Amino acid sequence: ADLEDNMETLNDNLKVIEKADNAAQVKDALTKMAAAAADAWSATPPKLEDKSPDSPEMHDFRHGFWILIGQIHDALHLANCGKVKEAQAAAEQLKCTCNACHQKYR
Amino acid sequence: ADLEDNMETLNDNLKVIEKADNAAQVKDALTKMAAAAADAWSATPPKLEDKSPDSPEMHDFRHGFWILIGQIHDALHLANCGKVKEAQAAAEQLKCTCNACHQKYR
Amino acid sequence: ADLEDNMETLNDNLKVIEKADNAAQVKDALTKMAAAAADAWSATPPKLEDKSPDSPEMHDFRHGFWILIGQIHDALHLANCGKVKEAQAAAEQLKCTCNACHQKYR
Amino acid sequence: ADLEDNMETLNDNLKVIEKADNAAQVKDALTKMAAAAADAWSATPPKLEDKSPDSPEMHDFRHGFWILIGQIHDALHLANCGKVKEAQAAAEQLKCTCNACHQKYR
Numbered sequence: 042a043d044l045e046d047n048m049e050t051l052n053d054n055l056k057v058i059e060k061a062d063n064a065a066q067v068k069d070a071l072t073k074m075a076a077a078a079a080d081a082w083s084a085t086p087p088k089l090e091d092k093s094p095d096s097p098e099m100h101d102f103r104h105g106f107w108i109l110i111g112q113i114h115d116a117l118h119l120a121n122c123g124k125v126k127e128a129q130a131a132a133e134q135l136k137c138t139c140n141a142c143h144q145k146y147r
Numbered sequence: 148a149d150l151e152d153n154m155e156t157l158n159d160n161l162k163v164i165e166k167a168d169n170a171a172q173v174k175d176a177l178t179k180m181a182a183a184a185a186d187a188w189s190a191t192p193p194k195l196e197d198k199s200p201d202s203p204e205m206h207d208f209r210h211g212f213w214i215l216i217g218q219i220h221d222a223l224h225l226a227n228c229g230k231v232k233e234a235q236a237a238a239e240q241l242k243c244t245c246n247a248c249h250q251k252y253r
Numbered sequence: 254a255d256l257e258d259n260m261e262t263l264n265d266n267l268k269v270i271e272k273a274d275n276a277a278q279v280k281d282a283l284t285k286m287a288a289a290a291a292d293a294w295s296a297t298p299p300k301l302e303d304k305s306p307d308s309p310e311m312h313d314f315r316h317g318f319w320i321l322i323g324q325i326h327d328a329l330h331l332a333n334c335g336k337v338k339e340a341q342a343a344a345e346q347l348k349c350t351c352n353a354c355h356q357k358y359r
Numbered sequence: 360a361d362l363e364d365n366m367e368t369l370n371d372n373l374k375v376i377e378k379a380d381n382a383a384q385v386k387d388a389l390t391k392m393a394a395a396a397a398d399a400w401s402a403t404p405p406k407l408e409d410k411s412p413d414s415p416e417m418h419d420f421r422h423g424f425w426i427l428i429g430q431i432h433d434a435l436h437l438a439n440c441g442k443v444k445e446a447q448a449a450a451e452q453l454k455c456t457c458n459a460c461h462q463k464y465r
């Protein structure tokens with residue numbers, strides 16, 4: 042449940058996908074990432090505890106996970122069609138979104 | 148005109164967005180990026196020179212511009228509404244799309 | 254609460270949007286739709302009752318809500334900016350997502 | 360080039376996809392649709408000739424094709440992974456977008 046637990050999962054599985062050598066292994070990893078992203082979406086980070094749940098910052102915070110999940114879902118779709126390398130390249134790119142939210146809210 | 152020229156407009160303008168003080172500045176920079184992106188769409192990069200107009204590759208390449216185009220269009224909605232900082236955050240996220248395309252194709 | 258209840262909120266509110274005279278009306282209706290959509294996300298429809306939590310099906314189903322969520326969020330940006338008619342047009346387009354999910358899963 | 364030519368192509372190929380019984384035939388059709396949508400995107404419909412090229416109506420007109428192409432690109436991706444029925448269902452759904460733009464601008 043904890044935001045510091047979803048982030049762990051997110052970081053771990055990224056490593057798993059990088060080392061993967063087949064589609065099934067990538068798919069399995071993308072799925073846990075998807076689930077951790079989904080769960081995180083509903084959280085309040087230490088930096089935004091003082092902000093309106095309805096604030097522009099929390100709509101954006103939640104919107105960053107919306108973007109992530111989307112990109113996880115595209116990566117997953119590549120792995121489901123056997124396209125392993127394309128799906129690992131997509132997972133690699135995920136880090137830019139991770140960073141763009143970390144820069145504003147971590 | 149050129150692909151290279153399209154890319155310069157894109158890169159110069161992101162900087163103008165980062166440094167902007169007001170909405171009009173960001174709006175003007177996004178409009179020039181929309182026009183560059185649209186123009187770049189029909190280009191063949193030197194690394195896909197030998198591939199068919201209908202290669203998985205050229206379709207993927209065009210699609211990255213489709214994404215950039217939608218992003219810049221959303222940033223623009225923000226700037227037209229005077230939301231300067233959220234437009235600048237949108238530009239930051241936009242970089243990821245730049246980079247993903249450059250990883251595969253530059 | 255229920256899936257059925259989530260769907261009613263969704264349907265009632267689209268009507269309020271169509272009939273609205275001003276931005277505040279549309280904004281309020283979109284906020285109630287955002288909340289319904291988020292809640293509906295975790296549900297299992299009676300037609301996917303026998304399928305795994307990780308079936309191509311349940312992933313596809315969740316993804317339709319992901320789309321609706323992003324659409325309603327964009328409509329909301331419009332309404333927060335006072336763009337009443339463009340928000341109402343956004344709601345019209347939004348119906349397609351409703352229908353696509355209902356074709357596969359209702 | 361003509362807008363009345365892209366619309367024809369768009370309508371014809373839809374019929375082709377409905378009757379298709381295999382992935383290659385669907386893919387071929389989705390590709391011509393993609394090309395006709397791309398070309399249409401740059402046009403001025405009889406109803407908007409008097410509007411600013413920069414108007415909210417023309418940003419939206421162009422934005423309707425952006426949505427279409429996106430959905431064509433997802434349909435295509437299903438066909439490229441052998442998923443024929445899912446890709447024909449996706450092509451069927453395209454009609455709701457066709458209609459939502461026709462309702463405002465045809």
Ligand code: HEM
Pocket residue numbers: 044045048049051052053055086087088102103104105106109135136138139140142143146147
């Ligand atoms: C694959 C994508 C991501 C990865 C691998 C990842 C990884 C991490 C890691 C390892 C930490 C803990 C670092 C520390 O203890 O100092 C962290 C924290 C954090 N992350 Fe992420 N992250 C990702 C995406 C995101 C996104 C999209 C958001 C926001 C929308 C986000 C928001 C945050 C915040 C606010 C913290 C600080 C946690 C705290 O103060 O308890 N992360 N992330």
Ligand code: HEM
Pocket residue numbers: 150151154155157158161192193208209210211212215241242244245246248249252253
């Ligand atoms: C706003 C985001 C973007 C920025 C800021 C950007 C920036 C640049 C710059 C400055 C260059 C050439 C100079 C150099 O070597 O650095 C370049 C080259 C290139 N870009 Fe981009 N770019 C962006 C988006 C894209 C996208 C979305 C695509 C494809 C969909 C793309 C494809 C390419 C290719 C293929 C080249 C090399 C072309 C050549 O060698 O002539 N870029 N980019």
Ligand code: HEM
Pocket residue numbers: 256257260261263264267298299314315316317318321347348350351352354355358359
């Ligand atoms: C704003 C758009 C939507 C509207 C207006 C809407 C409307 C409705 C209504 C009024 C019902 C139940 C009553 C009836 O039979 O008509 C319903 C049922 C249902 N909807 Fe939606 N809906 C929307 C979006 C969605 C989406 C996005 C999904 C999936 C991603 C979905 C999945 C379902 C399912 C599975 C049922 C049947 C549930 C049952 O039998 O208990 N709907 N919808």
Ligand code: HEM
Pocket residue numbers: 362363366367369370371373404405406420421422423424427453454456457458460461464465
């Ligand atoms: C698969 C999707 C689509 C199909 C099958 C389709 C089909 C058609 C057809 C058959 C016509 C001609 C009807 C007549 O002569 O009376 C037409 C016209 C038109 N379409 Fe579409 N359409 C699609 C999508 C769109 C979209 C997305 C837009 C706008 C963004 C659009 C804008 C228009 C307009 C403005 C006209 C009137 C043409 C004129 O006055 O010359 N269509 N379309």
